Amino acid sequence: KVTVFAAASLTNAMQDIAQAYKKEKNIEVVSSFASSSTLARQIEAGAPADLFISADQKWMDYAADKKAIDPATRATLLGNSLVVVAPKASAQGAITIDEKTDWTSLLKGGRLAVGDPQHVPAGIYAKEALQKLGAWETLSPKLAPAEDVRGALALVERNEAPLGIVYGSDAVASKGVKVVGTFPEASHQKVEYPLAIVDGHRNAAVSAFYDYLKGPEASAIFKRYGFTTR
């Protein structure tokens, strides 16, 4: 038995990974899914997780500061691209995203759907990219902010906003939107999922699955759910 605390966005990928691992090695991978905030606080308080996958470096930093992970095992496991999506029925085809992108033409008179950049992580990263590309002056008054990424997708899914900014895994999970662009990684803080072994849990079975998470079979599952691997 190996116990993994994983950010909830990883639920389906980790469930598939657990299936592959149990069939090939005959070890049960038991996962607990919640927000990175919830999981880090449980681990800090002494929860018996073996592995922790956070959806950001901030909550892994937290766990490390409290001496709850083994820092020698900490490593970025996954990334997520920042993508521009369009309604499936839109005339919009894929385009090149850079400093020259004519956002006003692409908006066709409407608004850009984003997570509220005051608190939604995808909206924070969207605003960073647009500001660094020099497009924020244009797009700031033309936003359609939502309370979360789901609400931002819903605008684009329902063809109610012509464009939206989400993560690559968000785009893959949403059948009703299509990717029309990818932000340069240099344009914003990298979206990263670090993996680490929990303090006191670095044994053979835990290390074995720890290593498997970086191997080909797991990388293929992560890739098809829209994450980037390392």
d(CA 25, CA 54): 25
Query: How many other C-beta atoms can be found within 10 angstroms of the C-beta atom of residue 162?
Result: 22
Distances (CA, A) of 18 to 40, 48, 100, 145, 201: 21, 18, 44, 36, 19
156 is in an annotated binding site: no
105 is in an annotated binding site: no
- Residue 112: partners with Cβ closer than 8 Å, 6 or more residues away: 103, 139, 142, 143, 144, 161, 163, 164, 165
36 is in an annotated binding site: yes
d(CA 191, CA 203): 29
Binding residue numbers for molybdate: 9, 36, 122, 149, 167
Binding residue numbers: 9, 36, 122, 149, 167
